């Protein structure tokens, strides 16, 4: 009132659609200035031309289900995020440690990298066996080590008392061990691509290895031993599978075209660029 | 100041040099005051 | 009616004859951070007209062999304007951008550019080395090129190892010399956090890649500059401290 | 009422070429086409305008001014220009 | 080309504040512009010559 | 409502007082913790101790008038702001020019400089005479030359046609000439002290003569001639007096203690500092 | 109750035990410019928390012979902080200041300082020359000393040729070592114009002059610093352009 200038939606909305879209009967049109076919791809909007407008269609009531394509059924499938090798007999050793990264290798990585942001819970399953595949009645310990907790320095270390760190004791002959994990990020979503640096300061142009790393994705360490006072002589391998549940995804992006060279980095080899397609004989002959 | 944002593009066989005419005026908040006598004109002697 | 258009923000204005509509990314407008989403307790500053306005960067000359260029937005504007000064004195940053790309050409020129806003755009190292310690990493000045921008080595993969054909899954617009002379896209603030540092983090990149190359006839004008104009929109700052530019 | 404003002066252009300012294809990008100070009562471009002659009978002036540019080039020519006004405190900008 | 001057105003071009202008427009009327006296002629008289 | 923080007097008042204040009868007080005498001069507020509180007073109804002390009666008195010497016979010459400054000399300058800001109208009076004081029936012309108007270059110049510039034709034997002037500043008040520079740019530490000058105080030039085609032989002196009326004043300040060395500048000579007071014999003897 | 006090503005806070009240100059608060008083038509920017806050300058060491110091406010803050950056990028400026002066000392020290806010404070040249062309003029760095401040040559006339005894006609406060350890004054924006340039014009000066000198006994602490804290209050800016610092 003393001064006036201090005195001062979206676009669309989501429709619940249980089944695929139907088709309605149409007939020939002859008239002017009505043209569903002509589009402008420059505007950045995809063609809104439908079936019914382009040619004559019948009445089709479509019963095909759309459910199986939801992102929450798309990640419901478990996959192998890591495999850790434990040899209790070799030299001293005695324990194995695996820093938790689900980028460890391909198939599940390539799925999760078609979205920039994902929030979700997880379910880990531990399939353990001998190098020979056989099972033997030895008890194992799986201890989870959140960021900042001291790592086990040996098989006899006091780290394994686990007054705080959650553990799983399971014999090797028993069914696999399975646990649920919440969403533990300090942020509001996991992000598989972070463009930026974790810290301030100088950034050399020789070795940038600090670049790209997002601290919000560091969940700490998973450790495993075999529980005895004397060192057993055996070799052992632990595969880790994870379902991914209660999932939400934001700002989708393209799939990886090129083979992955590194675990944490999206590097590729520029001489070998694959040209995702298959080569052909000229054009204007299709197979 | 008047700057080139991008460039001046012309097809072939068309003049490559052109002209911008410039113009000036006032708006409804424009006012004046203290009327004086202008310096633009001079007179050396009486005009017969 | 739809072709012609004019924007305005701050003291700056843009007019276009031949423009084709406007892209509003992900169907949402830029907004201030709501009370529920907020975390940091300090009162943020909202400069408005001093920050929000169109800034024009230096122009790129587009040549028959040009491979494309890219930028990082909470980078290009960190050293320029009043927006850049607030960004160096504040630890926290939020805003959306209104983006405009401009390329003139005659009705005798032909070609097409692909303008795209690609969030969290992470360039990659180029080499066959699989060992993580000896693997190449893409410089500092290649990651944050600043106002001058950087150019692609191999635009087909977008330097990200990802096919450019699928880049249409990002808010994008074509500038086609026969159709429109400019492309315009408004980007709301997106990130996993309500505020984030301006100097460390780059929310999104811009990619102008000459899909169909530039072609013309002898006697036509050879020099075809490309100019980009960006308006930080609905800005916020917080965490005041001494200036840190790096 | 808008009136013809002279920008090109120099020692050249003779009589009527003083009204026109050239635009042409530039090799180096981001180049300055023309400039002038916007004081209407000052010796310069505004003396040719009829707003500049009527404000010389008056000591003071207050209000907003508008400048119009019309492009006389051929229909097939295209381009984009940036016209900017810089309030006082420095000489004319060196770069755009 | 139409022969009409630009109708573009302040409020449309950029963001402006609320300004209530008290400046007077009176002194510019043609009737106050010619109210000032001036010398239209001077005549020389010599009675002795 | 979406965000809360965007959702967001004086002290005293003026009393109309026609006459001086009265006095009310008081008597002795003996009690504790009521002490009008003790003040704190550190707070920056002057003592509010009155008569009635300090000692016993009678009932006095004061009829003395307060009117004569208003600023509008204080400047109602005319004073000499400038004097211009015109010799029409000497060499060529023929005209006199006086740039309007009321700081020309002392008495009126020292009054107006006890306020920082003054808005007012003015009334000029021109007393013209011969060097000998005598009056002779010659006609004079007083032309006012607003800022930016071309100055007279000679007695015969076309500048004197005065189609715009206001003029005063008066014979020398007639009563003085008197005119009213409005408030012509481009700002909202005249200001007798401007700390700052009129322009941008570099400011040398050798010659700063640009410093201190306020353009808003420049009212232009006052010119005078004597109207004939042939040059008269006489000497002439024109004193200019101005009443100052419809006056308003802001943010008062102290008077000048030191003699004025320059017209536009508040310079003084630091060796001669006057110590405004009169010297005395020790203390504790009053005259 | 009245002795103790705490201010707050922006992210900065000041607490005082021994303070004596607060001076509000000319009985008016700082305000934004009303619509009627405004002239320039652009929308001014109102940064608030980034600009309005307490800024502390370097400290002056007060010695037995000290003659006093002075400052110019839309000067000291032009090169420091975010306030200084807005001032260089904007042609127009308006704001009031909340001012605080601080001098500690023991109950065994004695002395008094006179803190005063003296609008349009114009220093003068010192010399006997009456000719205007050869007359001395007081430097650039003496007129606008910047953050470091300048000291009086002869405080009795305040360098203005005006008696210091009458300086009490200005908003003022004493800091008396036996009574209070700090002085505080709030100054509304005053000038003949609604906005004015920050780098050219200095609205008002501050004067700390040691009226009664500093005296103490052997064994007491010798070093007695004086520190000033100033909060630009209720700020406004306009006329955006490229940075001009001089
Ligand atoms: C008893 C062992 C339980 C282990 C519980 C750990 C669960 C970890 C949280 C889910 C995984 C978070 C997503 C992983 C991020 C990425 O793989 C890397 N940190 C980034 O390269
Ligand atoms: C026919 C002659 C009429 C002359 C009318 C002129 C009136 C001038 C306006 C009143 C005086 C303005 C106050 C003067 C300012 C100061 O003296 C200097 N300019 C500053 O040093």
TrEMBL record, chain B:
It comes from Coxsackievirus A10. The chain holds residues 517 to 564 of 861 of the full protein. It is found in: Host cytoplasm; Virion. This is Genome polyprotein. It comes from the Viruses. Coiled coil: none annotated. Component of immature procapsids, which is cleaved into capsid proteins VP4 and VP2 after maturation. Allows the capsid to remain inactive before the maturation step. Lies on the inner surface of the capsid shell. After binding to the host receptor, the capsid undergoes conformational changes. Capsid protein VP4 is released, Capsid protein VP1 N-terminus is externalized, and together, they shape a pore in the host membrane through which the viral genome is translocated into the host cell cytoplasm. Interacts with capsid protein VP1 and capsid protein VP3 to form heterotrimeric protomers. Belongs to the picornaviruses polyprotein family.
UniProtKB/TrEMBL annotation, chains C, G:
Component of immature procapsids, which is cleaved into capsid proteins VP4 and VP2 after maturation. Allows the capsid to remain inactive before the maturation step. Lies on the inner surface of the capsid shell. After binding to the host receptor, the capsid undergoes conformational changes. Capsid protein VP4 is released, Capsid protein VP1 N-terminus is externalized, and together, they shape a pore in the host membrane through which the viral genome is translocated into the host cell cytoplasm. The chain holds residues 79 to 324 of 861 of the full protein. It comes from the Viruses. It is found in: Host cytoplasm; Virion. Belongs to the picornaviruses polyprotein family. Interacts with capsid protein VP1 and capsid protein VP3 to form heterotrimeric protomers. This is Genome polyprotein. Residues 15-216 form the Picornavirus capsid domain.
UniProtKB/TrEMBL annotation, chain E:
It comes from Coxsackievirus A10. It is found in: Host cytoplasm; Virion. Interacts with capsid protein VP1 and capsid protein VP3 to form heterotrimeric protomers. This is Genome polyprotein. Belongs to the picornaviruses polyprotein family. It comes from the Viruses. Transmembrane segments: none annotated. Component of immature procapsids, which is cleaved into capsid proteins VP4 and VP2 after maturation. Allows the capsid to remain inactive before the maturation step. Lies on the inner surface of the capsid shell. After binding to the host receptor, the capsid undergoes conformational changes. Capsid protein VP4 is released, Capsid protein VP1 N-terminus is externalized, and together, they shape a pore in the host membrane through which the viral genome is translocated into the host cell cytoplasm. The chain holds residues 615 to 663 of 861 of the full protein.
């Amino acid at each position: 009132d003393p001064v006036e200038d201090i005195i001062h939606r979206a676009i669309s909305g989501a429709t619940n659609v249980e089944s695929a879209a139907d088709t309605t009967p149409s007939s020939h049109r002859l008239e002017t200035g009505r043209v569903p076919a002509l589009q402008a791809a420059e505007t950045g909007a995809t063609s809104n031309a439908t079936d019914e407008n382009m040619i004559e269609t019948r009445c089709v009531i479509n019963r095909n289900g759309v459910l199986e394509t939801t992102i929450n059924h798309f990640f419901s499938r478990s996959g192998l995020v890591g495999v850790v090798n434990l040899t209790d007999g070799g030299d001293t050793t005695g324990y194995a440690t695996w820093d938790i990264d689900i980028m460890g290798f391909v198939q599940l990585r390539r799925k999760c990298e078609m979205f920039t942001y994902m929030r979700f819970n997880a379910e880990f399953t531990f399939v353990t066996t001998t190098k020979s595949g056989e099972a033997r009645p030895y008890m194992l310990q799986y201890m989870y080590v959140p960021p900042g907790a001291p790592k086990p320095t040996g098989r006899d270390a006091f780290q394994w008392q686990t007054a705080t760190n959650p553990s799983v004791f399971v014999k090797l002959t028993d069914p696999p061990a399975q646990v649920s994990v919440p969403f533990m990020s300090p942020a509001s979503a996991y992000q598989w691509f972070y463009d930026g640096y974790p810290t301030f300061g100088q950034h050399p142009e020789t070795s940038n290895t600090t670049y790209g790393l997002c601290p919000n994705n560091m969940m700490g360490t998973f450790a495993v031993r075999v529980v005895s006072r004397e060192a057993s002589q055996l070799k052992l391998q632990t595969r880790v599978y994870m379902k991914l549940k209660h999932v939400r995804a934001w700002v989708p992006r393209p799939i990886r075209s090129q083979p992955y060279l590194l675990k944490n980095f999206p590097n590729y080899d520029s001489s070998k660029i694959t040209n995702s397609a298959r080569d052909r004989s000229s054009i204007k002959q299709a197979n | 100041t008047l700057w080139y944002q991008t460039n001046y593009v012309v097809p072939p066989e068309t003049p490559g040099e052109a002209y911008i005419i410039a113009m000036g005026a006032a708006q409804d908040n424009f006012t004046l005051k203290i009327c004086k006598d202008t310096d633009e004109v001079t007179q050396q002697a009486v005009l017969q | 009616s739809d072709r012609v258009a004019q924007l305005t923000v701050g003291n700056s204005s843009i007019t276009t004859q031949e423009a084709a509509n406007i892209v509003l990314a992900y169907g949402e407008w830029p907004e201030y951070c709501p009370d529920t989403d907020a975390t940091a307790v300090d009162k943020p500053t909202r400069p408005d007209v001093s920050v929000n306005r169109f800034y024009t960067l230096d122009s790129k000359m587009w040549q028959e062999n040009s491979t494309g260029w890219y930028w990082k937005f909470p980078d290009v504007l960190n050293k320029t304007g009043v927006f850049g000064q607030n960004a160096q004195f504040h630890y926290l940053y939020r805003s959306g951008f209104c983006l405009h790309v401009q390329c003139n050409a005659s009705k005798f020129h032909q070609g097409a550019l692909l303008v795209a806003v690609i969030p969290e755009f992470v360039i990659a190292g180029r080499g066959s080395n699989t060992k993580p310690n000896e693997a190449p990493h893409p410089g500092f000045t290649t990651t944050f090129p600043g106002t001058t921008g950087a150019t692609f080595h191999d635009p087909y993969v977008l330097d990200s190892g990802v096919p450019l054909s699928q880049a249409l899954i990002y808010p994008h617009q074509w500038v086609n010399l026969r159709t429109n002379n400019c492309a315009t896209v408004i980007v709301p603030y997106i990130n996993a956090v309500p505020f984030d540092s301006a100097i460390n983090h780059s929310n999104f990149g811009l990619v102008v890649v000459p899909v169909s190359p530039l072609k013309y006839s002898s006697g036509a004008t050879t020099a075809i500059p490309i100019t980009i104009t960006i308006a930080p929109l609905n800005s916020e700052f917080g965490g005041l401290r001494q200036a840190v530019s790096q | 009422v808008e009136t013809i404003l002279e920008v090109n002066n120099t020692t050249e252009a003779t009589g009527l070429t003083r009204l026109l300012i050239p635009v042409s294809s530039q090799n180096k990008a981001d180049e300055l086409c023309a400039a002038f100070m916007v004081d209407p009562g000052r010796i310069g471009p505004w003396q040719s305008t009829l707003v500049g002659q009527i404000c010389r009978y008056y000591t003071q002036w207050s209000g907003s001014l508008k400048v119009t540019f019309m492009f006389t080039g051929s229909f097939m020519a295209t381009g984009k220009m940036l016209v900017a006004y810089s309030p006082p405190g420095s000489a004319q900008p060196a770069n755009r």
